[PDB]
Every structure is written in C-alpha cells, then in structure tokens.
Amino acid sequence: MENFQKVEKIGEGTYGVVYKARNKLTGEVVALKKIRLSTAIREISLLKELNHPNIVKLLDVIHTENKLYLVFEFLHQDLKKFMDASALTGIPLPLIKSYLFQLLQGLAFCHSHRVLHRDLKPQNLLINTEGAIKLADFGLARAFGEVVTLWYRAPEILLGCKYYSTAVDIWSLGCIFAEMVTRRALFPGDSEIDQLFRIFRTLGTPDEVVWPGVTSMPDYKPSFPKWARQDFSKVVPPLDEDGRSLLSQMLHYDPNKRISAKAALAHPFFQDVTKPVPHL
Ligand SMILES: O=C1CC(I)=CC=N1
Incomplete structure (x- = not known):
C-alpha cells in the first residue's frame, strides 16, 4: 500500500x-x-x-x-474474542457492569448527535488493557446501506420496518448484556424467522397490547405461533433484580417503550459501578 x-x-x-x-x-x-x-x-x-x-x-x-x-484507531481486542477467552470463568460482574455503563455512555453520545449504529454486535465493541470499552462503526449503516449475524437485531427490523430509531441499538446492547452474564448468546438465530421465533419463545409472541402497530408491520403474519412470555429470572440467572429490571426495559418489544441510553445510565443497577482492569 x-x-x-x-x-x-x-x-x-x-x-x-x-x-x-x-x-x-x-x-x-x-x-x-x-x-x-x-x-x-x-x-x-x-x-x-x-x-x-x-x-x-x-x-x-x-x-x-x-x-x-x-x-x-486500533484497540487491543474485540469483545467477541474477550467473551470467548472468558467463557470458562465468565466475565466478573463488576467488569460486565463497567462495560455496559461505558457502552451506554457511547450510545447516549451518538444518539444525542442523531447518529445510530443499527448493527451493534460484540465484534464492533473494542477493549483496551485498562478497562475501557469503545463502540466502532456508528453511522456507517445509514451512510452505506460468510453469513450475516442476526443475533442482535431488534424485532422491528426483523418484522420489515423500514424506519430505524435509537431503540434498535438499545435492543442490541441488551442482547450483549445478557450474553456477558450467561456466557451464551440470548437469541442465536440462523435465519430471520428462527431469530424472530427465538425472541417470541422467550418474550412471548408480541401483540397489539404490548406493541401497538405490531400486527400492521410489513412482515408480520397472523399465522405466527402464539407463545406465552417467560421470566428474565430463568433467562439470565444469576443476575440480580436491578440487572433484570434494566435488561427487561432494554428488551421491551415496542421500540417506543425501550429505555433510552441516557435513562439507563441513571438505573439503580449502576449505583455501585466501578472501572476494573480486565484479565486479558
Ligand atoms: O482495533 C481493532 C479492530 C478489530 I476488528 C480488532 C482488534 N482491534
């Protein structure tokens, strides 16, 4: 070159x-x-x-x-690799909490400047040696338009909605939070419909009560199976009630009901946040 x-x-x-x-x-x-x-x-x-x-x-x-x-800028390591290297022990909770807090600060910043990511995933999250984490590739999906990863895609995107909002990034971050805690992807779909049914089996099939307008979205079909909704308590143990409350708010079906990054930073989950040094 x-x-x-x-x-x-x-x-x-x-x-x-x-x-x-x-x-x-x-x-x-x-x-x-x-x-x-x-x-x-x-x-x-x-x-x-x-x-x-x-x-x-x-x-x-x-x-x-x-x-x-x-x-x-080049950073030491991506979170997908760190998550893989940490699988036998798990990432310690104080470090999960620190990383989530910092990621929410990055989202809040970008969102306040009217920039979305739209494709967050562990590969785009980069860590340094002392405890920082950073998001890469904000703004690229709007500017530009081996298999694509669907695991972090918000349900409105999977249901063919053509209109993105800040909420798509909160959904993806919620999925990443859950994966840090449990050491397993939350919704590891291998096709759009498997991704959709993986969300529906965990959260329940959405309806007009929880998500006004859902039944009118482009790829919604009245023939979708109707699953009842499970409890975060089975899904992300041993996360405490504050963590489950936050996660639940990040994973509301209706994008308009999903917690904002700025509001998430105020959640009681972060009362005791610190900035630990990672074990690379
Ligand atoms: O800065 C980077 C990018 C990527 I992709 C991997 C590690 N460092």
Missing part, C-alpha cells in the same frame, strides 16, 4: 476486509477497513468529528484509486 507499511488481514468486516496496518509517515498502528464497491463520502466524513471516550475514533476517510478505506 502506498501510504502504509506492514498491512495484515484481521478478518472480514461488515463492508469489506479489515486490516491492521502501520501508517508509513507516522508509524502508528491503525484498523484499516476497506469498503467493497458520492453521498456516503461526505456523510461518513462527518463522523470524523463524532469524538467520545467510548467511541472508536474514525481517523480518516481515504478515497484514492477509486477505492474507499476507513482508518480507525
């Missing part, structure tokens, strides 16, 4: 290959995301201004040789 030394594939990202790369001029290590191929360039370039401690810094947008690359 003209402008990088020591370029190494990390893996396949949402939009193309992701590399660890060394900037030739400065010697810094960055995450270089190739976008597999006018409006998207200016919109993503605005994200270079969207800066916060819990947001992965977008350093540059490189548009050269009719190719597009996003340059992000």
Whole structure:
C-alpha cells in the first residue's frame, strides 16, 4: 500500500476486509477497513468529528484509486474474542457492569448527535488493557446501506420496518448484556424467522397490547405461533433484580417503550459501578 507499511488481514468486516496496518509517515498502528464497491463520502466524513471516550475514533476517510478505506484507531481486542477467552470463568460482574455503563455512555453520545449504529454486535465493541470499552462503526449503516449475524437485531427490523430509531441499538446492547452474564448468546438465530421465533419463545409472541402497530408491520403474519412470555429470572440467572429490571426495559418489544441510553445510565443497577482492569 502506498501510504502504509506492514498491512495484515484481521478478518472480514461488515463492508469489506479489515486490516491492521502501520501508517508509513507516522508509524502508528491503525484498523484499516476497506469498503467493497458520492453521498456516503461526505456523510461518513462527518463522523470524523463524532469524538467520545467510548467511541472508536474514525481517523480518516481515504478515497484514492477509486477505492474507499476507513482508518480507525486500533484497540487491543474485540469483545467477541474477550467473551470467548472468558467463557470458562465468565466475565466478573463488576467488569460486565463497567462495560455496559461505558457502552451506554457511547450510545447516549451518538444518539444525542442523531447518529445510530443499527448493527451493534460484540465484534464492533473494542477493549483496551485498562478497562475501557469503545463502540466502532456508528453511522456507517445509514451512510452505506460468510453469513450475516442476526443475533442482535431488534424485532422491528426483523418484522420489515423500514424506519430505524435509537431503540434498535438499545435492543442490541441488551442482547450483549445478557450474553456477558450467561456466557451464551440470548437469541442465536440462523435465519430471520428462527431469530424472530427465538425472541417470541422467550418474550412471548408480541401483540397489539404490548406493541401497538405490531400486527400492521410489513412482515408480520397472523399465522405466527402464539407463545406465552417467560421470566428474565430463568433467562439470565444469576443476575440480580436491578440487572433484570434494566435488561427487561432494554428488551421491551415496542421500540417506543425501550429505555433510552441516557435513562439507563441513571438505573439503580449502576449505583455501585466501578472501572476494573480486565484479565486479558
Ligand atoms: O482495533 C481493532 C479492530 C478489530 I476488528 C480488532 C482488534 N482491534
């Protein structure tokens, strides 16, 4: 590469290959995301201004040789790998709580600046060595439009709603919270309908009482099976009532009833939050 030394594939990202790369001029290590191929360039370039401690810094947008690359700061590890490495012991609760608190601060920041993620998942959550966690790839899905992960997708998206809101990110984060606590994905679907029925079997099939308008959504079918709703108490033991209360509010069916990031930060679950050092 003209402008990088020591370029190494990390893996396949949402939009193309992701590399660890060394900037030739400065010697810094960055995450270089190739976008597999006018409006998207200016919109993503605005994200270079969207800066916060819990947001992965977008350093540059490189548009050269009719190719597009996003340059992000490089962080030590992603949460999917950390979760896998932590599976035998579990992530300690104080660290789960710290990470959730920080992720909510990142969401609250982006949402206050009218930027959504729309595709949060553990792979886009990055950790450093001292206890910070950051979200990557905010804003890309609006700008741009191996198998896709559906496990974190909000039910309105699965039911074919064409209108995103902040609530989609709260749903995904709730699913990630549950997975940290139980060491198992909450809703590991392998197709849209398996994902949908996995949510319905746990939370009950939604209806007009809990979710006004649900029956008029594009992909809703009156023939869906009607499951009764289970209790978070069987789903995420041994999480305490404060954690279950918060999670329950993050996973309301109606996006309009889902707790906001800002309100979640005030929840009693976080009264005793701290910032521990992770065991890498
Ligand atoms: O900065 C990063 C990105 C990814 I994907 C993995 C680890 N560090």
